[PDB]
Amino acid sequence: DKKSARIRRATRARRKLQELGATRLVVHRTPRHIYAQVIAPNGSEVLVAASTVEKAIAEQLKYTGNKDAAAAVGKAVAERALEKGIKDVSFDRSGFQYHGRVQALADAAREAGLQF
Amino acid sequence: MFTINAEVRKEQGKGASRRLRAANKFPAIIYGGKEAPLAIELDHDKVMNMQAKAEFYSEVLTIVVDGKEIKVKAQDVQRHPYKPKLQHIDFVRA
Amino acid sequence: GKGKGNVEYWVALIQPGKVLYEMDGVPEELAREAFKLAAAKLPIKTTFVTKTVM
Amino acid sequence: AKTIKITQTRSAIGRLPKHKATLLGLGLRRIGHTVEREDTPAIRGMINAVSFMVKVEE
Amino acid sequence: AHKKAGGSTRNGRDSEAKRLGVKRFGGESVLAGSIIVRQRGTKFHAGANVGCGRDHTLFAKADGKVKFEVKGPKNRKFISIEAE
RNA sequence: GUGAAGAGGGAAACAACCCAGACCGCCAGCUAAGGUCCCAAAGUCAUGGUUAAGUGGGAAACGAUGUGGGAAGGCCCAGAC
RNA sequence: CCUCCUAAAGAGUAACGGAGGAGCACGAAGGUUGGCUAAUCCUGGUCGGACAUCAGGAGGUUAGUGCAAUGGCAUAAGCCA
RNA sequence: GCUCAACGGAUAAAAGGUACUCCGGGGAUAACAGGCUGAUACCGCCCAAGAGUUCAUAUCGACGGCGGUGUUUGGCACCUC
RNA sequence: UGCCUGGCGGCCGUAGCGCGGUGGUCCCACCUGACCCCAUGCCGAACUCAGAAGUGAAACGCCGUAGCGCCGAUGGUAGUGUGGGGUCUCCCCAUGCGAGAGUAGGGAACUGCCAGGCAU
Ligand SMILES: [Mg+2]
Ligand SMILES: [Mg+2]
Ligand SMILES: [Mg+2]
Ligand SMILES: [Mg+2]
Ligand SMILES: [Mg+2]
Ligand SMILES: [Mg+2]
Ligand SMILES: [Mg+2]
Ligand SMILES: [Mg+2]
Ligand SMILES: [Mg+2]
Ligand SMILES: [Mg+2]
Ligand SMILES: [Mg+2]
Ligand SMILES: [Mg+2]
Ligand SMILES: [Mg+2]
Ligand SMILES: [Mg+2]
Ligand SMILES: [Mg+2]
Ligand SMILES: [Mg+2]
Ligand SMILES: [Mg+2]
Ligand SMILES: [Mg+2]
Ligand SMILES: [Mg+2]
Ligand SMILES: [Mg+2]
Ligand SMILES: [Mg+2]
Ligand SMILES: [Mg+2]
Ligand SMILES: [Mg+2]
Ligand SMILES: [Mg+2]
């Protein structure tokens, strides 16, 4: 399955981060929405979460599944992390090729202030 | 159709069981049912003679312990490896 | 010395209770006679056992 | 607080070194030596270990 | 039939034992860099603060106390160092 | 574990087996192993069985109406063997 | 010199004990990043079959690991770039 | 830069005979005898296919099995070099 | 608060498989099309991008099912540490530890954080 292959791809970097203890900015890209979360190193506590599924972000977007929606959601998640003082995270692409919407989200977060 | 007079075991374990089997009795268990299992102390010679019938392992035995009758089935039998003796009998409450 | 020996025959270690030979389709007395004849050729004490449900 | 008395009734010759060390821990020194100790689970364990060669007057 | 016969053997070879196995057992307190287990292949895996060398030797990377646990979906055995 | 490098008592004799670790003396007592008829210290001790083979006091498959105990079973005063 | 067993569930442990290998290879067969997952069998299919390539399924790592055996390996240590 | 591979590597550089022998030692280690053991050897016995005109057991006795002796060939290396 | 969905875990088969059913407002998936960014040792299959017509078909989620997988007592048995004993290449007794298999039985997971949807 596609998602099984994606999980298999992601697991290595996820375990490396999980043992390193880095706060994790995990992305999740779908054909329509792109989700971003920042999660504690233990993995069982969601620090912040910004997604196109929610009205506050979506209402400023034409289509929720493209590079511009990704840039908007990355900007939002980075600003909320900076308001929670998260400051320094590490990027978990979750198997998605770091390119296109995922890369645009990453650059939006980097310019907003998240360090990775 | 067969009635088996049984008495309650006082001590369990390898030593007590081998003491029984030397003293011409043998341990048995009554499990199954909705209550805790009961360990009993059967009379080896009578039980061997009565199990000689092939319907012992088919009809519902009755066990008389402390006057209380228990209707059981013969579930499993452990036999001596090279003797016509019994070592243990599993009864199921029924 | 000078190494181990060469394989000469094959055995099957027998412990008490092991049911060596089994037989079916014959009368019981003839089975007893046949088993007596067979046991006379073996170096281990034996006995005659029957089938039971359990 | 309760005290038991332990009397060595057999030799320590040919015993396992662990048995000899248990005898020493109990403080017993020779056959017919009686010592007084406290009644603790540890002491009971020592006595159980060397129960074949000591007698206990509880 | 007088004296004897004769006959060489083809075996009689072996290698120096490598002294593998668990060096520091569970509950022990190690210094940083202490070898916890020498092994062939990750029979034991590297948990928290435990590093795996090239020969799959597990060494504690932080001071503390050893801790074995069955972890993961494959019920593998992980050595971790509780912070002490 | 013992002997080696440990004597003493027992196993007849018998380093290595069982009991037990000799500082010296005593014409004192209690014991371990092992024993108590005589050699040879100590029960011709008490109770209930077994063996009739000198078994005890060397040895197997196998054989046998030896004898003792046990749980059954078969045929029987229309009187059975 | 390496691997398994003997080796008595820590380490170690002998024999003219039972089995096998080494006296190298690689500039990539190393590093990293990204990606991928095997054997076998069945079905269908030009030459072309028991075994060539193609497609589907069952299967589940019974594969692979430059070379022995063991321990590992799916996050792959296996296969490409 | 050593197949110094007898791989902790005596020299850079080394094979044999002695019944013509000699010395120091050993029963630490062989041949002879003794000893322990009894694979082998020898002698018994158990089951009994079959042979024996029929009939296993007059006489043999297969396929197997269990012992005895210390009578050969041995094993070990305890006494004696 | 209730229920559904998505993500990250906890845990690692009482949690997996099979079989039957069910879901599309939201989510997810399939889907539509490739100047493009990006791509196939050929192929927009996969990866990627721009989208949203349609369908939950497959997948996934959930529900129900014991046919398996899985877990699993009590009892007994095997083994075994220490001390004894026997006709001792194997056993037995006192005491301590006590399985494996099997039996009754359980069993179609449970659970935390965040977000969205619906009914509030
Ligand atoms: Mg016992
Ligand atoms: Mg060797
Ligand atoms: Mg000397
Ligand atoms: Mg002496
Ligand atoms: Mg000494
Ligand atoms: Mg003496
Ligand atoms: Mg004698
Ligand atoms: Mg004397
Ligand atoms: Mg002294
Ligand atoms: Mg006296
Ligand atoms: Mg006298
Ligand atoms: Mg070992
Ligand atoms: Mg050991
Ligand atoms: Mg390689
Ligand atoms: Mg590599
Ligand atoms: Mg040399
Ligand atoms: Mg050398
Ligand atoms: Mg000379
Ligand atoms: Mg000699
Ligand atoms: Mg000689
Ligand atoms: Mg001789
Ligand atoms: Mg002599
Ligand atoms: Mg002499
Ligand atoms: Mg069990």
Side-chain angles (χ1 to χ4, degrees):
Chain A
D1 192 356
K2 298 172 76 158
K3 68 181 178 67
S4 87
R6 196 180 52 82
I7 293 318
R8 177 187 49 74
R9 280 197 298 273
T11 298
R12 183 201 185 97
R14 287 181 155 175
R15 296 308 182 189
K16 181 62 177 183
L17 293 173
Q18 188 274 331
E19 62 86 20
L20 284 164
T23 292
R24 204 172 53 201
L25 168 55
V26 57
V27 306
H28 175 53
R29 190 208 72 218
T30 70
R32 200 189 284 276
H33 296 294
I34 171 162
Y35 296 164
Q37 287 171 310
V38 170
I39 312 185
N42 61 13
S44 284
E45 294 294 328
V46 176
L47 298 195
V48 299
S51 51
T52 68
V53 74
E54 65 183 1
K55 296 183 289 294
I57 291 184
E59 294 294 328
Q60 288 69 240
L61 294 174
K62 182 175 73 175
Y63 193 55
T64 74
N66 48 4
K67 291 171 76 175
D68 290 341
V73 65
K75 182 62 65 68
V77 65
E79 78 192 357
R80 301 177 204 190
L82 279 189
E83 303 305 323
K84 298 298 293 295
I86 301 299
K87 182 62 65 68
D88 204 4
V89 301
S90 198
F91 203 63
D92 199 16
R93 54 183 192 84
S94 280
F96 300 108
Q97 193 92 355
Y98 179 74
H99 159 252
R101 298 155 68 191
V102 173
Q103 165 164 9
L105 189 152
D107 306 305
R110 280 196 181 103
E111 303 306 319
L114 272 189
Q115 298 295 109
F116 57 96
Chain B
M1 182 179 72
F2 309 121
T3 182
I4 301 299
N5 178 59
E7 60 206 320
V8 181
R9 284 185 81 194
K10 62 181 180 292
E11 182 165 308
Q12 302 174 351
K14 173 185 271 194
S17 309
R18 286 183 182 197
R19 275 198 274 272
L20 267 183
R21 304 208 192 89
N24 189 359
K25 300 183 180 299
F26 69 111
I29 191 70
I30 299 157
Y31 60 91
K34 280 73 176 175
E35 52 263 56
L38 175 63
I40 55 178
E41 183 178 1
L42 295 178
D43 178 17
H44 169 263
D45 281 303
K46 288 190 185 299
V47 180
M48 187 82 217
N49 284 321
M50 293 177 71
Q51 75 91 47
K53 279 97 167 178
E55 65 183 1
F56 181 89
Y57 306 96
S58 71
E59 190 276 331
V60 297
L61 278 296
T62 187
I63 288 177
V64 185
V65 62
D66 307 302
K68 175 74 179 293
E69 293 83 3
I70 305 173
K71 307 302 189 295
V72 293
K73 283 272 197 183
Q75 179 74 37
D76 185 23
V77 54
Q78 281 195 8
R79 313 184 167 279
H80 192 282
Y82 59 96
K83 278 170 168 227
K85 295 174 92 199
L86 304 167
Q87 276 184 332
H88 192 245
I89 298 289
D90 291 331
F91 291 114
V92 167
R93 286 199 184 82
Chain C
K2 316 279 158 212
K4 205 190 208 283
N6 303 321
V7 175
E8 294 294 328
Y9 53 97
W10 305 71
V11 310
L13 316 187
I14 302 299
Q15 297 108 354
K18 180 64 137 200
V19 174
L20 305 166
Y21 291 96
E22 281 182 4
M23 185 180 288
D24 171 7
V26 304
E28 175 176 284
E29 48 85 19
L30 187 153
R32 292 182 183 271
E33 283 169 11
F35 279 165
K36 209 157 189 283
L37 265 293
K41 319 291 198 154
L42 298 184
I44 62 171
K45 174 71 74 68
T46 46
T47 185
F48 185 85
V49 285
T50 69
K51 162 174 275 161
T52 55
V53 64
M54 324 179 288
Chain D
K2 182 175 73 175
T3 61
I4 51 167
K5 284 188 178 293
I6 301 167
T7 295
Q8 181 181 336
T9 62
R10 292 196 206 286
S11 165
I13 295 161
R15 305 306 177 175
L16 307 178
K18 212 164 298 170
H19 287 352
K20 291 178 203 147
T22 294
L23 281 171
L24 187 153
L26 280 180
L28 295 174
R29 300 180 173 282
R30 83 197 77 86
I31 297 169
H33 190 198
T34 303
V35 301
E36 183 178 1
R37 301 279 168 257
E38 69 275 16
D39 191 280
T40 305
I43 299 292
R44 290 312 191 151
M46 294 178 71
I47 294 170
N48 175 49
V50 289
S51 68
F52 59 93
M53 85 170 80
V54 311
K55 174 166 163 51
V56 177
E57 303 155 353
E58 305 108 339
Chain E
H2 204 283
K3 199 256 177 181
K4 75 153 179 61
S8 172
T9 185
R10 294 176 59 188
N11 313 325
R13 277 165 276 97
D14 188 74
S15 57
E16 293 173 318
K18 290 290 170 288
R19 280 94 173 154
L20 312 178
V22 177
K23 305 311 194 185
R24 307 265 150 92
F25 293 81
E28 295 209 12
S29 75
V30 302
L31 283 180
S34 305
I35 292 170
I36 295 157
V37 55
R38 293 181 60 237
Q39 64 196 355
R40 295 288 173 242
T42 61
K43 183 178 184 293
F44 289 96
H45 292 269
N49 291 313
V50 176
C52 180
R54 45 178 310 270
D55 67 341
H56 305 117
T57 291
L58 300 196
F59 62 98
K61 278 167 41 174
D63 282 318
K65 305 217 303 184
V66 194
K67 169 76 165 67
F68 302 85
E69 69 275 16
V70 170
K71 189 256 180 186
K74 276 142 178 199
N75 273 331
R76 277 165 177 170
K77 309 163 294 298
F78 288 85
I79 301 181
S80 49
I81 293 285
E82 280 143 13
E84 182 65 26

